[PDB]
Design an enzyme around this catalytic site. Structure first.
Site, mmCIF file in Angstrom:
data_model
loop_
_atom_site.group_PDB
_atom_site.id
_atom_site.type_symbol
_atom_site.label_atom_id
_atom_site.label_comp_id
_atom_site.label_asym_id
_atom_site.label_seq_id
_atom_site.Cartn_x
_atom_site.Cartn_y
_atom_site.Cartn_z
ATOM 1 N N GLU A 357 0.822 -1.204 0.000
ATOM 2 C CA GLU A 357 0.000 0.000 0.000
ATOM 3 C C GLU A 357 0.859 1.258 0.000
ATOM 4 O O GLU A 357 0.497 2.259 -0.625
ATOM 5 C CB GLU A 357 -0.942 0.000 1.201
ATOM 6 N N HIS A 487 -14.692 -12.246 -10.139
ATOM 7 C CA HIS A 487 -14.622 -11.096 -11.028
ATOM 8 C C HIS A 487 -15.487 -11.233 -12.271
ATOM 9 O O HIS A 487 -15.659 -10.241 -12.988
ATOM 10 C CB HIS A 487 -13.181 -10.860 -11.449
#
Lengths: 592, 195
Positions: A357, A487
């Site tokens: 991150e 997905h």
């Protein structure tokens, strides 16, 4: 009264209002992500509707302008980003129907309920329960029944929705001269720009196929070793000369292998390098955990996170004071806002996601120079690659004992670190044939050599011929498997994952060629190399402005995908894995 | 004579860039010490004058301006520098004499709800002359044949909003800037340095 300059003025007028409304939308999204209250839900919905409406309005304003032979080669790409009107190019009834269909897709994936006939009223759902049952239990028949029943009850309602999804999206792609939705997704990789740096669709799929072809033997020997260990564990029902079912592969879908680490580990006398025992002593907290990441990014030369963002960011879950989502996110709200949001633990998995991150945030610092309409990675997959490069450096013992964190006596040896490379090989290598297989399935269904009714045989044939997995029960069109992914219901492509893998391995090879710390790729570091930081930041600041081919030339000197860094990284494994893997059958039999 | 820089720097309302507040100084001997006494400043770099020679030469007239800009473009207010706020709103002379002060104004010149108060102009006919101030509805009628003057499609408004939020980062938070221009015309005596 000049027309190209008028278009440039329109670009300025678009981007200013776009950024100062996108900040309003993203701050409301962050407010939704902080405290779950219906006031925030209403604010986020209103802000998103405003943002979408204004985006459609400048989209119409851009569509009214001519595009033939207009080139600054930067403004042109901005207009290529802004020309797309969306799904409202056709009659709007079918577009609203399609959005309603996608809402149904998401809801039925979120509510894929399956329960046992023994206790129909007392049962578990997909996300919290079935995953931990798979990661804990090793039963053949129970996991097989749960897998099969879940896939059947999902496919019975997911088959027609996708079947009339594809026909609508064919003509949706036929609008503005594209041939299929897979071609539109490949057009994210399109470079119709400066000559000599060209990139198109046919050589894109050719590059993907070729790079998987040189990937293939390493996956084949890792697959043979995995099936050898499973036959050392469970040899009864499955023959040792054929494929294995997907429900002993560590995940119901098969898109990961890390859950097989406990079963398939070699050299078990040394458990993995774990220092979790030692924060009883050192007592490290999450804020200063972020602080070594910031010191790491200053060390390589990159700029640091500004002090105000420490109180902007949320560094700890609220707890019982209120409920919030637990998902590691790197929020770039706009106007130079950068926040990190996750429920922070103390383990190295959280440390590794913190490095990922922070890499996302640092890249967001890097492309802040370009206008708002060009504020994404040079392709769809550099965000998930930049953090993945930093994920590799902190894993090695050299980084832990260079900062003094590790006990000094451990270091590395001949006997260890195979237990470290095979963990990554289960994380990284096995994903690539799976993503290539299903995405080639979807693109070639879009190409049309598969009949729309017969989606099961080429599925299972390609699964045996690429990833080597066998179905134990035959499936008709009602037993629809491929729509059951996370997905597929969200309509996301997986080329970002194969591409991020190949890209960050090229990046690891490149940045290990400008740091002087030479050796095999896993035990080399990125820390404290100013030339390496210069090369990396030269890549990072580009954004979407120049094409991604020149972005990748800025670091490695090769335009196309080259898997040689991946092979060199996993070849210290490959000197030993195939040698122990010999005297077994090699390859996949289609009969089994 | 002490003239009140207490109204020059510390105030409530500073106007935007398209209308800088021009205040003349011809009847005082100003205490040039606020640059050390007021606050730590983002910008003390200035082309015109040095802190040693601000009081040495007997300077006869002073002009003072105050507005607010972005933290990214604090260095953009300089001779030679070009950009949509320098050569279109407030252009400096090529050999301007004087020293400019800038302070972060995020403490009170920024509303969390938002401040749609300041504006900035994006396009004049060309680069404006230095020290040229305009406040008008300069509708840049971008007509392939012209917008007939008011309230229609294709009619792009000149001034763009300058929305303000304290949640922004450094370089995009508000930064107020005051400039002090020093002039000696072919002039009588009006202001001299202190003793």
């Amino acid at each position: 009264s000049t027309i190209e300059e008028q278009a440039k003025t329109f670009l300025d007028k678009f981007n200013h209002e776009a950024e100062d409304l996108f900040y309003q939308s993203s701050l409301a999204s962050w407010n939704y992500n902080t405290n779950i209250t219906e006031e925030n839900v209403q604010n986020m919905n209103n802000a998103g509707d405003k943002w979408s409406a204004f985006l459609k309005e400048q989209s119409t304003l851009a569509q009214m302008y001519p595009l033939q032979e207009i080139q600054n080669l930067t403004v042109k790409l901005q207009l290529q980003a802004l020309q797309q009107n969306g799904s409202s190019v056709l009659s709007e009834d079918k577009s609203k129907r399609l959005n309603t269909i996608l809402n149904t897709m998401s809801t039925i994936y979120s509510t894929g309920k399956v329960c046992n006939p023994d206790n129909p009223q007392e049962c578990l759902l997909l996300e919290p329960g079935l995953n931990e049952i798979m990661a804990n239990s090793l039963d053949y028949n129970e996991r097989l029944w749960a897998w099969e029943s879940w896939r059947s009850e999902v496919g019975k309602q997911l088959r027609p929705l996708y079947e009339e999804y594809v026909v609508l999206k064919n003509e949706m792609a036929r609008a503005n001269h594209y041939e299929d939705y897979g071609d539109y997704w490949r057009g994210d990789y399109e470079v119709n720009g400066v000559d000599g740096y060209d990139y198109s669709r046919g050589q894109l799929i050719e590059d993907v196929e070729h790079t998987f072809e040189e990937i293939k033997p390493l996956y084949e020997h890792l697959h043979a070793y995995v099936r050898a260990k499973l036959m050392n564990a469970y040899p009864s029902y499955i023959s040792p000369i054929g494929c294995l079912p997907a429900h002993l592969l560590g995940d119901m879908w098969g898109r990961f292998w890390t859950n097989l680490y406990s079963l398939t580990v070699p050299f078990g006398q040394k458990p993995n390098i774990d220092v979790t025992d030692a924060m009883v002593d050192q007592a490290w907290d999450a804020q200063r955990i972020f602080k070594e990441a910031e010191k790491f990014f200053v060390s390589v030369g990159l700029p640091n996170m500004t002090q105000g963002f420490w109180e902007n960011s949320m560094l700890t879950d609220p707890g019982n004071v209120q409920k919030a989502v637990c998902h590691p996110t790197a929020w770039d709200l706009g106007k130079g806002d950068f926040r990190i949001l996750m429920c922070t633990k103390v383990t190295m998995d959280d440390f590794l996601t913190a490095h990922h991150e922070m890499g996302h945030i640092q890249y967001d610092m890097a492309y802040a120079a370009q206008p708002f309409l060009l504020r994404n990675g040079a392709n769809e997959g550099f965000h998930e690659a930049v953090g993945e490069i930093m994920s590799l450096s902190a894993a090695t013992p050299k980084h832990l004992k260079s900062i003094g964190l590790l006990s000094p006596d451990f270091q590395e040896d001949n006997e260890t670190e195979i237990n470290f490379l095979l963990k990554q090989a289960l994380t990284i290598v096995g994903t690539l044939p799976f993503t290539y297989m299903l995405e080639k399935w979807r693109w070639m269904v879009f190409k049309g050599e598969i009949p729309k009714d017969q989606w099961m045989k080429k599925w299972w044939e390609m699964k045996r011929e690429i990833v080597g997995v066998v179905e134990p029960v035959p499936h008709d069109e009602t037993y629809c498997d491929p729509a059951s992914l996370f997905h597929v219901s969200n309509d996301y492509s997986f080329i970002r994952y194969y591409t991020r893998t190949l890209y960050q391995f090229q990046f690891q090879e490149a940045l290990c060629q400008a740091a002087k710390h030479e050796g095999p790729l896993h035990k080399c570091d990125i820390s404290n190399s100013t030339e390496a930081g210069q090369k990396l930041f030269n890549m990072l600041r580009l954004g979407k402005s120049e094409p991604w081919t020149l972005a990748l030339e800025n670091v490695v000197g090769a335009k196309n995908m080259n898997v040689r860094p991946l092979l060199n990284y996993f070849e210290p494994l490959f000197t030993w894995l195939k040698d122990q893997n010999k005297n077994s059958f090699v390859g996949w039999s289609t009969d089994w | 004579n002490l003239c009140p820089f207490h109204e020059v720097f510390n105030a409530t309302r500073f106007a935007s860039v398209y209308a800088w507040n021009r205040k003349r100084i011809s009847n005082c001997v100003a205490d040039y010490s606020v640059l050390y006494n007021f606050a730590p400043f983002f910008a003390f770099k200035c082309y015109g004058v040095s802190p040693t020679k601000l009081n040495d030469l007997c300077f006869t007239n002073v002009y003072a301006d105050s507005f607010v800009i972005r933290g990214n473009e604090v260095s953009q207010i300089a001779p030679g520098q070009t950009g949509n706020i320098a050569d279109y709103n407030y252009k400096l002379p090529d050999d301007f004499t004087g020293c400019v002060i800038a302070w972060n104004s995020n403490k009170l010149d920024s509303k969390v709800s938002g401040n749609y108060n300041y504006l900035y102009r994006l396009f004049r006919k060309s680069k404006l002359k230095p020290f040229e101030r305009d406040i008008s509805t300069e509708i840049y009628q971008a007509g392939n044949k012209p917008c007939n003057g008011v309230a229609g499609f294709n009619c792009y408004f000149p001034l763009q909003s300058y929305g303000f939020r304290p949640t922004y980062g450094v370089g995009h938070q508000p930064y107020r800037v005051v400039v002090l221009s020093f002039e000696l015309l072919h002039a009588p005596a009006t202001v001299c340095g202190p003793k």
